[PDB]
């Protein structure tokens, strides 16, 4: 008879009715439901004696019902009474459901950057903050951060970082874990900057902890400010590591700007450590001193020659093996065999020699004078063009007067034959410089109207403006592509358009739609590449979704193949799921889709092997089409670097397979094609170096992404294999107590010897020497604290680290 | 040797049931729980039919590192009640197998229910069930693991709920257990849902019975989704009460169809005093409609023993003798009162006249008013005209009575040839069967 | 890390649904 009590209009009876309803909500859910219209009037009525209690019983009408939004309306009427039930079995779930309503409303407010965010219900916000306070009382950092980004409010997040005030894990690398699962960069940057500020608030701001602001925020002034503090405290030892760490972890640009801030003793040292050129020379020293390269493997491949692709395949494969070593012993042993190559493959071969000498830098340019065309043959113009391409490879990823000198050589160079590799080399050397002069010269080659030189110019145009997001550059390239009759220029330009739009994440989405919309297949291929470059190392569903539709929809096989390659580039950051998407695609009617899937599976996994990925590759090797087979052999090799027989059972079997296909004449010349190259990929740098597109910090490697994407276009263009050479990160660790001093350091991995074996648990080094060490060994390595030279930085992973001398 | 042999087979069956559930629970989700748990529940029902040694097997079920085979040897070594119920947890915590611990808690309760003490010891089993219920409450509320227990042990909780109903049947009723079930309904409102709520609610309706029909009306509002009806027998149970609610609510026409659907879903034998109750409701509601259903179509022998009254009552409905109906009502009032459909028989006493008019409507296209008076033995022609207005009622062919020479024109629907007049009539029938083509989509999804 | 795990499981469903659309689309293309 709850309705009967409501029928009499007495204020005391109004209180009696709500109290009676509270007593037996479950017994008579229908009675409240029948009177819900009357209850709603009372709940919203200020005149009602207990409108807040009526709202509390209104939530009871919805106790059987599941509507969270009605409970939020009841919270408005209840006011304090909803908050008063901070913990109450069923109501606790309903307030949590209101918290779910609150977070979605708050996320919508965060989505609006123009202001006019819809106001959160104050009563709803009050229950949420009160429960959030209970999480702080619980002291769990995870519970405290539980509504921190759900509300998308930094002020709540500051309370969550404070939590119970223990702040141990949160005041360290909690930012890295949050960044990995973070969905929006715009909200993430606010979280990242505030967390580094809290790290700065700690008496010692860890350089690794403040590194995330240094690289992800990429504010040149902020890195200059921390460097200035290091100069002010004269902490050169701490300063030396952060500058080297910045050079390895992130690209120049802002890094160049902090160098400019620093330039205008300690000042000379800080510029040198930031430049990191000496570290590259040390990496060259590590390679030249230590190379696990077997001449016999090269001889075994050399003996079986189709006399066509084999000469090119062997020269590139040896170049990968001796890259940076400068040990061109194979070239020295065979003169007639080298002479066999035609004028074009020979142009590629001189560029391959540059890959072998890519470490001495300015010293290598003096060495290249011996290989200079006047020193060698004036008649072979392609050799002259290859020499210019080799010069660019040696200075690639470095900005220097030599790059400007190459530009001067390009001005005096022949318009087509020399610029076939000369423009390509200059662009690779000037990649990311964004110099107007290099851009203008590349435009001159683009406006030469010769596609073969133009394709080289188009790739170069992308490299120099990589990540620029320059509307003028993109407009010029797209306009030329529309007006260029020759497909070869379009293909080079297509790679270039993708390179210029690098890591946009949404900036180039309109351009990506336009390229996909464009009727021309090559422009659509560029659009798939643009999806990959803009979303490189991103699991963003939007990039995957567009890629998903185009590969099925586009009839053209080349466009479908490009889409599969793009899927690998985006998923390098999360390569665990990279094989699963590929497996259905790996089996398909199109030779291109199967070949693309094998290539895609290899690139996303990269050096790491998913085991399922290695198993999937073996049937692809047995696939009838030679084009699919050639891709499978190379893809397996990319996974094989950074691997040993103990780690993976088939690592030797794939190696035996490559030798077998080269040995068998019956095997197709096209099918064997890259198996010899694949042996080079596994043996690259004597197996010392491996392909990694992701930094330990989680920053994407700009050289790694460029090399792999261009390497997929290497099938389209043979010389693009040299671009893969740049992306070969060493597994060695650099441990110097002083920048100019090499201490004797003997860190012991204490790991099984089989992982150490390269084709008793301890490790030793002498006068650190940086040498190839497995990343898994680096994870388990033990520093020599007992030794007089002990690393100041914890040697958690391989890389340049601070070292302490007693 | 003869007494040990039942113990050995039962212990081996329980060990296999535990091993299968545990192994599946360890690997995957959804397939992890209830994949064989329903089969284990029927195996448990077989164990209930096949019988203290079971408590000794229960004792120290798990300690830490898996030693179940060694534990089976220990159970044999014991061979070579309330303390036993809590003994395994007291002797050693499982240290793992959280879904198994609930199943392990369930296994002693079945022998306690089998004892049917109808005493405080049975209530102690209810207390043990409450301890098991607390583990079920914390399965997702406190433990953040997947709902293996919600997917499987909720059925164990449903068995415990039925045991709780047994304790209340021994006493009176527990609305608080239904309130606990309402808390389980809130758990159902969460990620996973169970339809055990309706069955306990049916018992709540049953407890109020004649005194309150509001609980049945509340049930109609309470009705939500759960069309999965995975038990199917549960859907029949929901249908049996839902049909009962409509029959008492005077919606006899909808009720008979619901009872027929409920009658079809009876996989369990329901041999004595069980399916007969479902049959009893269907026959009475059809008699209430006035259409006469002969008992020859089904005639289950147990339905027959309870049908000696109804069968004579069906003959009485056909006969024009009120005294025969009165003799049946007085002589066979018992048993029908036990069924609880006795009130429907009381309303049926007036309904006898309606059966005759329906027979007349099918038999005569245009019967005379005086003839209707002779057929139904109406005292006067004006009373027959009054009966004719009652005859129009609802769901019968238009009388279109002239009120003069035409008398009971009772004109039947014309052009009912499955042609244009029934074009909706014979196309709508196909739409429903064609709609059942959904079975091809549903089964195709399962692989 | 229950709040972080909720995001991780949510990511797994989002990736799977995104991939689920691709299989049906290619299967329809195969039918043609």
């Amino acid at each position: 008879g709850i309705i009967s009590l409501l029928d009499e209009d007495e204020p005391q009876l109004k209180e009696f009715a709500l109290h009676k309803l509270n007593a037996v909500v479950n017994d008579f859910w229908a009675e409240i439901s029948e009177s819900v219209d009357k209850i709603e009037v009372l709940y919203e009525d200020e005149g009602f004696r207990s409108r807040q209690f009526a709202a509390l019983v209104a939530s009871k009408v919805f106790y059987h019902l599941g509507a969270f939004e009605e409970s939020l309306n009841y919270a408005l009427g209840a006011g304090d009474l909803f908050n008063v039930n901070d913990n109450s079995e069923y109501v606790e779930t309903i307030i949590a459901k209101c918290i779910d309503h609150y977070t979605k409303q708050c996320v919508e407010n965060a989505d609006l950057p123009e202001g006019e965010k819809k106001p959160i219900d104050q009563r709803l916000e009050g229950i949420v903050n009160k429960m959030f306070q209970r999480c702080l009382d619980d002291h769990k950092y995870k519970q405290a951060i539980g509504i921190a980004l759900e509300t998308r409010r930094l002020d709540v997040f500051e309370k969550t970082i404070l939590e119970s005030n223990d702040v141990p894990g949160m005041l360290a690398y909690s930012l890295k874990l949050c960044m990995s699962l973070m969905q929006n960069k715009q909200f993430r940057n606010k979280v990242l900057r505030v967390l580094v500020k809290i790290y700065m608030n700690l008496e010692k701001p860890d350089f690794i902890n403040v590194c995330q602001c240094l690289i992800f925020l990429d504010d040149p002034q902020a890195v200059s400010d921390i460097l200035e503090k290091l100069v002010k405290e004269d902490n050169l030892l701490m300063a030396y590591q952060i500058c080297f760490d910045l050079y390895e972890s992130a690209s120049q640009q802002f890094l160049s700007s902090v160098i400019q801030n620093l330039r205008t003793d300690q000042t000379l040292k800080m510029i040198k450590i930031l430049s990191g050129e000496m570290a590259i020379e040390l990496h060259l020293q590590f390679l030249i001193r230590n190379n696990n390269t077997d001449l016999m493997i090269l001889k075994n491949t050399k003996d079986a020659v189709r006399n066509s692709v084999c000469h090119t395949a062997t020269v590139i494969a040896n170049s990968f093996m001796h890259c940076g070593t400068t040990s061109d012993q194979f070239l020295r042993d065979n003169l007639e065999w080298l002479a066999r190559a035609t004028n074009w493959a020979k142009f590629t071969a001189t560029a391959s020699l540059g890959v072998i000498h890519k470490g001495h830098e300015k010293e290598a340019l003096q060495l290249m004078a011996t290989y200079l065309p006047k020193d060698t043959s004036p008649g072979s113009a392609y050799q002259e063009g290859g020499g210019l391409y080799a010069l660019g490879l040696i200075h690639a990823n470095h900005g220097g007067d030599i790059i400007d000198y190459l530009l001067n050589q390009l001005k005096n160079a022949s318009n087509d034959i020399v610029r076939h590799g000369g423009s390509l080399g200059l662009g690779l050397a000037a990649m990311g410089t964004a110099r107007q002069d290099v851009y203008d010269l590349l435009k001159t080659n683009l406006y030469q109207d010769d596609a073969v030189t133009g394709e080289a110019a188009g790739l170069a145009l992308g490299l120099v403006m990589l990540g620029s997001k320059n509307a003028q550059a993109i407009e010029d390239m797209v306009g030329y592509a529309q007006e260029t009759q020759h497909e070869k220029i379009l293909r080079g330009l297509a790679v270039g358009i993708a390179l210029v739009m690098y890591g946009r994440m949404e900036e180039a989405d309109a351009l990506i739609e336009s390229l996909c919309r464009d009727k021309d297949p090559i422009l659509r291929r560029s659009g798939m590449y643009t999806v990959a470059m803009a979303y490189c190392g991103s699991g963003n569903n939007k990039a995957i979704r567009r890629l998903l539709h185009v590969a099925v929809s586009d009839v053209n096989d080349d466009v479908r193949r490009a889409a599969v390659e793009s899927l690998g580039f985006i998923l390098f950051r999360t390569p665990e799921q990279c094989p699963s998407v590929v497996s259905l695609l790996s089996e398909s009617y199109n030779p291109h889709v199967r070949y693309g899937a094998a290539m895609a599976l290899g690139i996303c996994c990269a050096g790491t092997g998913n085991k399922e990925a290695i198993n999937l590759l073996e049937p692809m090797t047995n696939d009838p089409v030679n084009y699919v087979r050639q891709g499978a052999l190379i893809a397996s090799a990319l996974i094989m670097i950074q691997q040993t027989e103990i780690t993976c059972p088939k690592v030797n079997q794939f190696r035996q397979l490559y030798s077998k296909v080269i040995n068998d004449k019956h095997d197709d010349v096209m099918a064997k094609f890259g198996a010899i190259l694949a042996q080079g990929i596994l043996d690259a740098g004597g197996h010392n170096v491996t392909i990694s597109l992701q930094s330990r910090t989680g920053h994407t490697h700009m050289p790694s992404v460029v090399g792999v994407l261009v390497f997929t276009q290497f099938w389209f263009w043979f010389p693009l294999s040299h671009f893969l050479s740049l992306a070969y990160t060493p597994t060695c660790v650099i441990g110097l107590n002083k920048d100019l001093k090499m201490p004797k350091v003997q860190y012991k991995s204490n790991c099984k010897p089989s992982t150490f074996a390269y084709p008793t648990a301890k490790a030793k080094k002498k006068e650190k020497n940086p040498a190839r060490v497995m990343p898994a060994q680096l994870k388990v390595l033990t520093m020599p604290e007992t030794c007089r030279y002990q690393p100041f930085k914890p040697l958690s992973i391989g890389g340049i680290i601070i070292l302490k001398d007693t | 040797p003869p007494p040990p042999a039942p113990q050995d087979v039962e212990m081996k069956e329980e060990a296999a049931t535990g091993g299968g559930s545990t192994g599946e629970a360890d690997g995957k989700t959804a397939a992890a729980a209830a994949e064989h748990s329903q089969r284990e529940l029927d195996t448990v029902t077989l164990e209930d039919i096949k019988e203290g040694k079971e408590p000794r097997f229960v004792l120290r079920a798990l300690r830490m590192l898996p030693s179940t085979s060694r534990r089976l040897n220990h159970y044999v070594l014991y061979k070579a009640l309330l303390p036993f119920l809590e003994e395994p947890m007291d002797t050693e915590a499982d240290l793992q197998f959280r879904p198994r611990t609930g199943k392990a808690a369930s296994t002693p309760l079945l022998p306690e229910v089998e004892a049917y003490l109808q005493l405080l010891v049975v209530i102690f089993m209810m207390n043990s069930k409450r301890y098991k219920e607390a583990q079920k409450i914390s399965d997702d509320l406190m433990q953040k693991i997947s709902t293996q227990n919600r997917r499987a042990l909720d059925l164990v909780a449903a068995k415990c709920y039925y045991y709780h109903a047994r304790v209340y049947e021994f006493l009176d009723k527990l609305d608080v257990v239904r309130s606990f079930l309402h808390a389980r309904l809130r758990t159902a409102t969460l990620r996973h849902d169970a339809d055990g709520q309706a069955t306990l609610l049916n018992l709540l309706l049953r407890n109020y019975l004649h005194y309150s029909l509001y609980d049945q009306a509340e049930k109609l509002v309470s009705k939500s989704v759960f069309p999965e009806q995975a038990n199917n027998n549960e859907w029949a149970r929901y249908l049996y009460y839902t049909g009962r609610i409509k029959a008492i609510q005077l919606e006899y026409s909808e009720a008979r169809r619901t009872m027929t659907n409920a009658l079809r879903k009876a996989p369990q034998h329901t041999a004595v005093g069980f399916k007969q109750t479902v049959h009893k409701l269907l026959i009475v509601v059809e008699l209430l409609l006035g259409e006469i259903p002969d008992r020859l179509q089904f005639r289950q022998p147990s339905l027959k023993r309870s049908l000696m009254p109804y069968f004579l009552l069906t003959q009485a409905v056909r006969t024009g003798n009120l005294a025969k109906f009165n003799q049946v009502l007085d002589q066979f009032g018992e048993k029908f009162q036990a069924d609880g459909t006795y009130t429907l028989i009381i309303r049926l006493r007036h309904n006898v006249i309606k059966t005759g008019v329906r027979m007349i409507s099918l038999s005569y296209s245009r019967i005379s008013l005086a003839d209707i008076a002779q057929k139904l033995q109406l005292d006067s022609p004006e009373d027959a005209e009054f009966i004719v207005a009652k005859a129009i009622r609802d769901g019968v062919i238009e009388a279109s009575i002239n009120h003069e020479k035409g008398y009971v024109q009772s004109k039947e629907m014309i052009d009912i040839y499955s042609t244009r007049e029934p074009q909706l009539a014979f196309h709508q029938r196909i739409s429903f069967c064609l709609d059942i083509h959904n079975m091809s989509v549903k089964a195709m999804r399962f692989p | 890390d229950l709040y972080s795990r909720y995001k991780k499981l949510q990511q797994e469903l989002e990736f799977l649904e995104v991939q689920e659309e691709y299989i049906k689309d290619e299967q329809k293309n195969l039918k043609k």
Binding site: E92, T93, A96, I99, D100, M131, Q143, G146, I147, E150, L584, E587 | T29, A30, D140, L141, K144, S146, T147, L190, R191, H192, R445, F446, P447 | L2, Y3, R5, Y6, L9, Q10, E12, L13, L16, E17, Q19, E20, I23, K24, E26, Q27, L30
Partner: peptide
């Protein structure tokens, strides 16, 4: 419970992967 039971709701969505396996078989 809000951020520790909502993850459990995503576990409910895991069954879609089983459907993806069934469709993958059709693709083959």
């Amino acid at each position: 419970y809000l951020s520790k039971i909502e993850e459990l709701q995503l576990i409910v969505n895991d069954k879609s992967q089983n459907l993806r396996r069934l469709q993958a078989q059709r693709n083959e």
